[PDB]
Design an enzyme around this catalytic site. Sequence first.
Site, PDB file in Angstrom:
ATOM      1  N   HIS A  19       0.836  -1.197   0.000  1.00  9.67           N
ATOM      2  CA  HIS A  19       0.000   0.000   0.000  1.00  9.67           C
ATOM      3  C   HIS A  19       0.871   1.248   0.000  1.00  9.67           C
ATOM      4  O   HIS A  19       0.522   2.250  -0.630  1.00  9.67           O
ATOM      5  CB  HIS A  19      -0.922   0.053   1.216  1.00  9.67           C
ATOM      6  CG  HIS A  19      -1.873  -1.095   1.313  1.00  9.67           C
ATOM      7  ND1 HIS A  19      -1.727  -2.092   2.251  1.00  9.67           N
ATOM      8  CD2 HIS A  19      -2.971  -1.414   0.588  1.00  9.67           C
ATOM      9  CE1 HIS A  19      -2.717  -2.958   2.125  1.00  9.67           C
ATOM     10  NE2 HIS A  19      -3.483  -2.575   1.118  1.00  9.67           N
TER      11      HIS A  19
ATOM     12  N   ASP B 197      -2.153   1.565  13.548  1.00 14.77           N
ATOM     13  CA  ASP B 197      -1.004   1.364  12.676  1.00 14.77           C
ATOM     14  C   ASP B 197      -1.264   2.018  11.318  1.00 14.77           C
ATOM     15  O   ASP B 197      -0.372   2.653  10.768  1.00 14.77           O
ATOM     16  CB  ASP B 197      -0.704  -0.124  12.469  1.00 14.77           C
ATOM     17  CG  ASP B 197      -0.032  -0.783  13.679  1.00 14.77           C
ATOM     18  OD1 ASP B 197       0.203  -0.113  14.714  1.00 14.77           O
ATOM     19  OD2 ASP B 197       0.266  -1.998  13.582  1.00 14.77           O
ATOM     20  N   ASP B 198      -2.470   1.859  10.768  1.00 13.64           N
ATOM     21  CA  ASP B 198      -2.741   2.414   9.431  1.00 13.64           C
ATOM     22  C   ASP B 198      -2.515   3.920   9.389  1.00 13.64           C
ATOM     23  O   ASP B 198      -1.846   4.431   8.494  1.00 13.64           O
ATOM     24  CB  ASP B 198      -4.183   2.136   8.979  1.00 13.64           C
ATOM     25  CG  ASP B 198      -4.456   0.665   8.748  1.00 13.64           C
ATOM     26  OD1 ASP B 198      -3.488  -0.137   8.744  1.00 13.64           O
ATOM     27  OD2 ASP B 198      -5.649   0.328   8.565  1.00 13.64           O
TER      28      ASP B 198
ATOM     29  N   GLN C 140       1.078   5.035   9.730  1.00 15.55           N
ATOM     30  CA  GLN C 140       1.797   4.879   8.473  1.00 15.55           C
ATOM     31  C   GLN C 140       1.494   6.014   7.518  1.00 15.55           C
ATOM     32  O   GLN C 140       2.398   6.521   6.855  1.00 15.55           O
ATOM     33  CB  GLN C 140       1.495   3.533   7.835  1.00 15.55           C
ATOM     34  CG  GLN C 140       1.931   2.370   8.733  1.00 15.55           C
ATOM     35  CD  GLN C 140       2.254   1.116   7.974  1.00 15.55           C
ATOM     36  OE1 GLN C 140       3.279   1.032   7.297  1.00 15.55           O
ATOM     37  NE2 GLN C 140       1.401   0.115   8.107  1.00 15.55           N
TER      38      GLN C 140
ATOM     39  N   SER D 247       0.896  -8.937   1.308  1.00 14.95           N
ATOM     40  CA  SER D 247      -0.543  -9.158   1.473  1.00 14.95           C
ATOM     41  C   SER D 247      -0.865  -9.056   2.946  1.00 14.95           C
ATOM     42  O   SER D 247      -0.068  -9.491   3.782  1.00 14.95           O
ATOM     43  CB  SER D 247      -0.936 -10.560   0.992  1.00 14.95           C
ATOM     44  OG  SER D 247      -2.276 -10.883   1.353  1.00 14.95           O
ATOM     45  N   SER D 248      -2.051  -8.525   3.248  1.00 11.73           N
ATOM     46  CA  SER D 248      -2.558  -8.546   4.634  1.00 11.73           C
ATOM     47  C   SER D 248      -2.894  -9.958   5.129  1.00 11.73           C
ATOM     48  O   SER D 248      -3.214 -10.137   6.307  1.00 11.73           O
ATOM     49  CB  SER D 248      -3.795  -7.652   4.770  1.00 11.73           C
ATOM     50  OG  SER D 248      -4.903  -8.240   4.122  1.00 11.73           O
TER      51      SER D 248
HETATM   52  C1  LIG Z   1       2.315  -2.171  -5.076  1.00 12.66           C
HETATM   53  O1  LIG Z   1       2.387  -3.504  -4.565  1.00 12.66           O
HETATM   54  C2  LIG Z   1       1.335  -4.051  -3.869  1.00 12.66           C
HETATM   55  C3  LIG Z   1       1.459  -5.342  -3.360  1.00 12.66           C
HETATM   56  C4  LIG Z   1       0.406  -5.916  -2.645  1.00 12.66           C
HETATM   57  C5  LIG Z   1      -0.762  -5.166  -2.439  1.00 12.66           C
HETATM   58  N1  LIG Z   1      -1.939  -5.412  -1.820  1.00 12.66           N
HETATM   59  C6  LIG Z   1      -2.770  -4.334  -1.900  1.00 12.66           C
HETATM   60  C7  LIG Z   1      -2.157  -3.315  -2.616  1.00 12.66           C
HETATM   61  C8  LIG Z   1      -0.889  -3.885  -2.939  1.00 12.66           C
HETATM   62  C9  LIG Z   1       0.167  -3.310  -3.653  1.00 12.66           C
END
Ligand SMILES: COc1ccc2[nH]ccc2c1
Lengths: 287, 275
Positions: free
Chosen positions: A44, A85-86, A89, A193-194
């Site tokens: 992000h 945290d969001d 950031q 990835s989350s």
């Molecule tokens: C620019 O690279 C990424 C990689 C994983 C991501 N997951 C959500 C946005 C995103 C961007």
Amino acid sequence: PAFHPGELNVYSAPGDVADVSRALRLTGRRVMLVPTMGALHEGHLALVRAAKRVPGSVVVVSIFVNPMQFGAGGDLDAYPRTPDDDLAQLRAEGVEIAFTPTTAAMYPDGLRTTVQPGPLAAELEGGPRPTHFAGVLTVVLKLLQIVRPDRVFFGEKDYQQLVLIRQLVADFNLDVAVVGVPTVREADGLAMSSRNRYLDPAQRAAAVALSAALTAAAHAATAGAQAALDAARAVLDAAPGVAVDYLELRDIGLGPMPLNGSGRLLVAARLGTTRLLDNIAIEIGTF
Amino acid sequence: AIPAFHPGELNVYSAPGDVADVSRALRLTGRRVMLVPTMGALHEGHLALVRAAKRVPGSVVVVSIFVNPMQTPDDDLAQLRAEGVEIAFTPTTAAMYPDGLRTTVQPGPLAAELEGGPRPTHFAGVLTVVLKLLQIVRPDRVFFGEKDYQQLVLIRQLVADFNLDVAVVGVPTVREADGLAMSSRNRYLDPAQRAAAVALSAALTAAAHAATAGAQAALDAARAVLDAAPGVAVDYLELRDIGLGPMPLNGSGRLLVAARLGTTRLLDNIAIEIG
Ligand SMILES: COc1ccc2[nH]ccc2c1
Ligand SMILES: COc1ccc2[nH]ccc2c1
């Protein structure tokens, strides 16, 4: 609503961010939108940085865990939420606007008028989740109408999503540029990835197979599509507790056209209960 | 480079990108862009929409003429010149749908009711093309006739649901001297049918005045007038609230009727105030 320049302004009311965006746009600033579901990671932050580098940019990051893109129980409840945290950031990144709407503000009439995606939404990620992309495209349409950005930023990691958003923008004549940003990866190749937080140490080690498989395929592809797919399959087959859902090589638009020289290789796999995605550009017969 | 625009003349554009660029340029010059979506074959109903758009201070009027497959060229343009309209947008099907039917708008459940009975995909087509036109033209206000009331209500749902920044303006129905709502279909009626057709408007106006005696009296009065007409096959006669939900015990509502006379389908509706 007040706007304090050079600091993070948080707005929840759609009217508030719409008013501030409009006003900024009218003074010459170009509004950039990064739509997210929170739980922000370096992927992000790459999007935010891409947006920030546009000259005269003001960056709007939306954080909204959109219920319409989840199926019944219990994915919506399980989605990670790390609001403190969001926002930390975003402040560290010099973002000036965070848009954090409520479910009631976005869906005061429930699901009424919605976006119906084209046939791509029924394939790949949409196969067993036939309503998922209607949820995504409906919320993205709304966010675009509320914020009215000049450009909107998405990661390439969710590639099918990005393609469907380009379709939305084209098909509805939306006056916004869609910017796809290359996937940010961990040092060993794992796509950000989350959902990576749900990999235990063993699963985390095994998860490297997705990116290793894709990159092996990309280099194998000088020898053709079969060679590329088989190289990826071999790496995935060698990986402990990686259960492949799909591995598909398609035209770059993922649409009703055969692979001809420029492709995208997409993978989805489960590690325990954690479903991971990744994808890579493939050039066929090209070294 | 912005396409040529000549103030005070009818400027005709067929390319979406052209009308988009001109509209954007004009709004930056202190004009307020007004959109009147039509399917051509213009009549006095459409002219009332145009006049409503024109009277807004600062207006520049964009009239779109597009037969939308999903839901008289020279004569239409002459009528617009005569009204002082400065922009006509006349795209081809291929220009509106360069990738065919792909992403579309799915209306809410109202779209399945009333007119959606015989034409269950009609409103999806209408909302899809209206959304596109709103995105191409980016008007401050968009104008629709009240005659297609369910259409108007669904457009208001579209605008609210997708957070569109446009004012939707409903314009009261233009009528012939005996009350028949304006429609391109009226000319198809033979003399017997044309005489019988007055029953729709007469039933509605009777109901509006009967309404001091309550909802049932209004409905029964309207039904009696329709019952006095030969060859009028009523598809529905319904009293609803103004947003087309169920009619409340008291307050404002809308009475809608549709009927078939031979092969010709006619619609009408009226405001009702209960008691
Ligand atoms: C620019 O690279 C990424 C990689 C994983 C991501 N997951 C959500 C946005 C995103 C961007
Ligand atoms: C404003 O009055 C009217 C009457 C009938 C109509 N048909 C299409 C637009 C329209 C408008």
